[PDB]
A paper describes a structure:
Anterograde intraflagellar transport (IFT) trains are essential for cilia assembly and maintenance. These trains are formed of 22 IFT-A and IFT-B proteins that link structural and signaling cargos to microtubule motors for import into cilia. Here we use in situ cryo-electron tomography of Chlamydomonas reinhardtii cilia and AlphaFold2 protein structure predictions to generate a molecular model of the entire anterograde train.
IFT-A is made up of five structural proteins (IFT144, 140, 139, 122 and 121) and one disordered protein (IFT43). IFT144, IFT140, IFT122 and IFT121 all have tandem N-terminal WD domains followed by extended TPR domains. The resolution of our IFT-A reconstructions was limited to 18.6 Å, potentially making subunit placement difficult. However, the AlphaFold2 models of each of the four WD-containing IFT-A proteins showed unique combinations of angles between the two WD domains and the position of the first TPR repeat. This allowed us to unambiguously place the WD domains in our map and fit the C-terminal TPR domains into the connected continuous tubular densities. Finally, we identified a spiral density corresponding to IFT139 to complete our model. We do not locate the disordered IFT43 in our overall model.
Residue numbers in the entry:
A (entry chain I): 527 to 842
B (entry chain L): 790 to 997
C (entry chain G): 386 to 897
The structure:
């Protein structure tokens, strides 16, 4: 993107929000070599690091304390998220920041502390979010301090707040929120959706099977299976709940017997259905793609397709 | 006698009625969290099947702690089941009898994968070793080909030490075909990502 | 009665709430008073309500605003009667006096003394059904310009239930399948139903009084004439206290939703409550619901002391075995009313075979989709789940788990929000231990410990170890210890080493 104008390392340099030539700061994670451009752009005074968080990152330019939570692991990947663009006094030059509170320096030489709009909202001592901790639930669902939101939905005590934080953490791949919701009280059957998990580590086979069990998002599940240890699990869901939107996708590339399948139940959804014409066509090409299957020239399935061709020629 | 303990006196009576001596025994003790002595009640009375809750619970526990040896002896226990839960014998190679061999052979093959991985790979990672000297001697004649990843394996297993030591063992005691085969399969594996800065160069270096 | 689109009800001695269902809420509903009419029946035909008492009979003109006034009145030569929209079949003591608008006998239809006096009169909207004194009923088609007999003269009720007192007749749309209750005699007084199937001249049997109620109104469903929607208040003899609730609340008024088979008698589908806004009588049944009654009053105008005219005193009682019916199209209506005929009676031709074996070119929205209650899902899987259609998806989501027989249909029967129907057939396939241990899945994992004990003490330890690790996962340490310890094989780790490491032995694993 250009020359690195300013380098803002941590104490070890395992992550750093360096400045580009344009002036926009960019969080860098060289441990796994990931670059996330910070939503704050333009010249800053400095990137001082949160002593309470190596991922949450305050940009204090003398104008605002641009906090930036860094979320490296999700369904997609690393992301830098603004936890608040909260103003800073010009005389309060940011020396360091702790717990979302920037410890600045006075003009005569002293130490002064500058909080932000929502970090201190979730810190203890804010009795607005402690005597009435529903605001801590809300703002911890905002700043992804959701364990504060977890505890606060415990105290404000309903299932839907638990499920709200449960999905809000399932999006960022945290499940103990969902456990706290559902395994205390769930709808009907998500604990048998969790029980059907293998010892495979790619997160796309995993989530793809998870939403095969949820019987939803079968295009994304089949796509995640195409990047998985097995691609044919995509076609599996495709015969499991009778789709052709990607049964044909894996059938043209993997299995003419799956083409013969797709055309067998296409004849079927046109046999009992009627319009035995395209049912006849689909039954006939089901016989053909059974004959030209990469597997066997499967005689019993072809005979079933021929019973189909019997009835569909009969009604043709 | 209204007692499972006083059942045993003849609730272990004449074989070919051992199903009848042990299942009337087994419905005294079986359903009350004692499906562990009811395992051996089932061993002759029916087949040992209410056995896998504890077995797979600690199998998954050992998988979690990367201590893959409780699951070793538990798949060995499943092999003891499927070696004695076969009415057809395992010794001869009739298809029923060879399949009778094969069921506990595959369970003991799970046992042996967990064995080899934990025992030898964990020699530096976290020491945990159990061995069978007759099995290890036959291994010293025939062990090399068992160590492929996707063949009835818990998966997620690194076999760096295991590949190296297993190849050496296959080389040593003879079966001169397998010595040459293990020369082709000596060691090429890498220590985990905490060692990535050094075993990038020491992948072949550290374990031949 | 909901007749001719006008759900007319009589809530008082003279007040006849002749509510057309299409009356605007700002338009007045049915308001009509009778001149102290000893009403032995009323016959309304889209603006000509004739009421009769046995000494006079007035026909009431009705507007579309339900302004009901007497168009004409006439004396009765016989107490009951029935109108062919201008010419009234009277229940004459020896014949059917087809008396005109002025009560003079326009046409003559005859029933001899072997039939008896044609006392029961009804035109079944195309078929004048005439149950006589001896219930020998010949039914008269009117699809031309006047009456002409359609169903031959034959006893409405059998000799074993003619001694049982015959009250009235509910003739079907074809005017042959005539439902007719028989209450028991003076020592018995138990209501049995005799659906006189004039298709075959047989006499159906359904003793409601031991079977759940004593029905008050009989009517067939307006969409399928075999669905006899039997309005049913619980009244009994002194032997049938089973269905009724306690004491004064003994009327759990539930419709015997019944597909009467024309061969094997009355066969029942479900007990659908009328209790929809203080409703204790079913006055009709539209397609998506059942048109029951309601309290008859005048709604106050919103935000003011004025009174808006009532919309309709007719509560549309939603029908319950028909799921994915009402939000969906009318292929649903045919397909799954037919399937529910296959439910109450028991058949296979209608929802499946009659639509396969005809060469019917289309792609329907709901070939059939509640059909899983006769254990078939593929009709909701290739019609719907080829694209997962939503307006039959209620019975599709039911349908993936009322396939439950533990034949890989358990796994499909437990996918998302739908283990409960798997449990329903766990009850049905005699495995209610799986009812238990999968009702633990619905969020009962706190008392799942003791219900697991009810299942297995191995299941006890499975649930306690999972539950101990459940609050270990939440963060709790000592309660994790206890339910670990309350698990019989969770107990084999916790007292063993220090009582204090199931969190911490879990911690060293990532280090390893």
């Amino acid at each position: 993107d250009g020359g690195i104008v300013r380098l803002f390392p941590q104490a070890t340099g395992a992550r750093l929000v360096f400045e580009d030539d344009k002036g926009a700061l960019h969080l860098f994670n060289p441990v796994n070599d990931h670059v996330v451009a910070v939503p704050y752009t333009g010249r800053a005074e400095t990137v001082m690091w949160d002593t309470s968080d190596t991922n949450v990152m305050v940009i204090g330019d003398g104008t605002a304390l641009h906090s930036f939570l860094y979320v490296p692991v999700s369904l997609t990947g690393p992301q830098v998220q603004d936890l608040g663009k909260q103003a800073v006094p010009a005389t309060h030059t940011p020396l360091t920041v702790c717990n979302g509170v920037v410890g600045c320096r006075l003009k005569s030489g002293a130490m002064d502390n500058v909080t932000l709009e929502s970090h201190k909202m979730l810190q203890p001592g804010d009795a607005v979010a402690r005597a009435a901790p529903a605001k801590r639930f809300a703002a911890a669902l905002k700043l992804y301090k959701l364990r504060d939101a977890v505890e606060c939905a415990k105290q404000l005590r309903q299932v839907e707040s638990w499920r709200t934080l449960a999905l809000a953490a399932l999006d960022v791949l945290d499940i103990d929120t969902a456990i706290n919701a559902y395994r205390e009280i769930g709808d009907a059957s998500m604990v048998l959706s969790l029980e059907r998990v293998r010892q495979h580590e790619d997160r796309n086979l995993l989530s793809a099977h998870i939403m095969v069990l949820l019987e939803k998002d079968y295009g994304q599940a089949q796509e995640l299976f195409l990047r998985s240890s097995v691609p044919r699990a995509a076609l599996e869901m495709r015969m499991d709940l009778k789709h052709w939107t990607d049964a044909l996708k894996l059938a043209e590339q993997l299995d003419p017997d799956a083409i013969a399948t797709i055309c067998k139940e296409h004849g079927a959804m046109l046999e009992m259905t009627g319009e035995y014409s395209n049912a006849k066509s689909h039954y006939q090409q089901a016989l053909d793609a059974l004959a030209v299957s990469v597997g066997p020239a499967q005689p019993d399935l072809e005979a079933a397709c021929k019973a189909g061709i019997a009835r569909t020629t009969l009604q043709l | 006698a209204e007692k499972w303990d006083d059942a045993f006196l003849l609730l272990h009576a004449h074989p070919e009625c051992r199903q009848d001596v042990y299942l009337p025994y087994a419905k005294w003790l079986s359903n009350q969290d004692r499906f562990d002595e009811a395992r051996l009640a089932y061993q002759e009375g029916g087949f040992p099947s209410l056995a896998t809750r504890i077995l797979e619970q600690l199998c998954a526990n050992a998988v979690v702690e990367t201590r893959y040896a409780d699951a070793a002896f538990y798949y060995y226990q499943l092999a003891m089941e499927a070696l004695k839960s076969i009415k057809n014998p395992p010794s001869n190679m009739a298809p029923s009898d060879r399949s009778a061999l094969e069921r506990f052979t595959e369970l003991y093959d799970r046992a042996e994968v967990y064995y080899a991985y934990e025992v030898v790979h964990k020699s530096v990672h976290s020491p945990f070793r159990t061995t069978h000297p007759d099995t290890l001697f036959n291994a010293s004649r025939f062990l090399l080909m068992r160590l492929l990843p996707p063949r009835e394996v818990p998966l997620g297993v690194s076999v760096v030490n295991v590949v190296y030591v297993l190849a050496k063992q296959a080389v040593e005691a003879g079966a001169f075909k397998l010595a040459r085969f293990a020369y082709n399969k000596l060691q090429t594996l890498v220590l985990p990502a905490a060692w990535q800065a050094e075993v990038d160069l020491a992948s072949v270096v550290i374990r031949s | 009665k909901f007749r001719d689109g006008v759900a007319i009800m009589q809530v008082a001695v003279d007040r006849v709430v002749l509510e057309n269902l299409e009356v605007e809420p700002q338009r007045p509903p049915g308001r009509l008073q009778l001149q102290d009419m000893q009403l032995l029946g009323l016959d309304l035909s889209k603006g000509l309500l004739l009421v009769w008492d046995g000494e006079r009979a007035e026909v009431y003109k009705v507007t579309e605003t339900n302004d009901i006034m007497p168009a004409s009145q006439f004396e009765t030569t016989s107490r009951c009667m029935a109108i062919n929209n201008d010419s009234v079949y009277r229940a004459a003591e020896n014949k059917v006096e087809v008396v005109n608008m002025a009560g003079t006998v326009k046409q003559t239809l005859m029933f001899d003394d072997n039939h008896g006096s044609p006392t029961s009169m009804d035109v079944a909207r195309d078929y004048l059904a005439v149950v006589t004194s001896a219930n020998i009923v010949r039914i008269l088609k009117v699809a031309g310009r006047e009456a002409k007999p359609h169903a031959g003269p034959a006893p409405l009720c059998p000799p074993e239930l003619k001694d049982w007192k015959v009250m009235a007749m509910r003739a079907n749309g074809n005017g042959n399948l005539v439902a007719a209750l028989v209450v028991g005699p003076e020592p018995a007084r138990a209501v049995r139903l005799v659906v006189w199937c004039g298709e075959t001249n047989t006499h159906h049997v359904h003793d409601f009084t031991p079977e759940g109620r004593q029905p008050v109104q009989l009517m067939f469903d307006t969409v399928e004439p075999k669905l006899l929607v039997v309005q049913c208040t619980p009244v009994f003899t002194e032997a049938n206290v089973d269905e009724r609730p306690h004491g004064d609340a003994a009327h759990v008024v539930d419709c015997a939703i019944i597909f009467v088979d024309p061969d094997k008698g009355i066969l029942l589908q479900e007990y659908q409550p009328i209790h929809t806004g203080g409703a204790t009588a079913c006055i009709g049944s539209c397609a998506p619901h059942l048109l029951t009654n309601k309290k008859s009053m005048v709604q106050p105008a919103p935000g003011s002391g004025a009174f808006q005219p009532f919309t309709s005193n007719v509560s549309k009682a939603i029908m319950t075995s028909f799921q994915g019916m009402q939000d969906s199209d009318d292929k649903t209506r045919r397909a799954l009313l037919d399937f529910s005929f296959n439910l109450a009676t028991g058949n296979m031709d209608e929802a499946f075979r009659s639509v396969k074996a005809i060469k019917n070119p289309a792609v329907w929205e709901n070939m059939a989709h509640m059909c899983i209650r006769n254990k078939r899902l593929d009709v909701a899987e290739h019609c719907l789940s080829n694209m997962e259609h939503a307006r039959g998806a209620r019975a599709l989501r039911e349908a993936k788990s009322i396939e439950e027989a533990d034949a890989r249909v358990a796994t499909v029967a437990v996918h998302l929000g739908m283990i409960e129907d798997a449990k329903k057939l766990y009850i049905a396939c005699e495995r209610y231990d799986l009812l238990n241990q999968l009702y633990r899945a619905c969020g009962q994992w706190d008392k799942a410990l003791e219900v697991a004990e009810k299942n297995d003490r191995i299941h006890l330890k499975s649930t306690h170890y999972a539950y101990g690790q459940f609050m270990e996962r939440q963060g709790d340490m000592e309660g994790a210890r206890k339910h670990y310890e309350a698990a019989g094989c969770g107990l084999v780790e916790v007292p063993r080493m220090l009582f204090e490491a199931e969190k911490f032995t879990e911690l060293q694993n990532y280090i390893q």
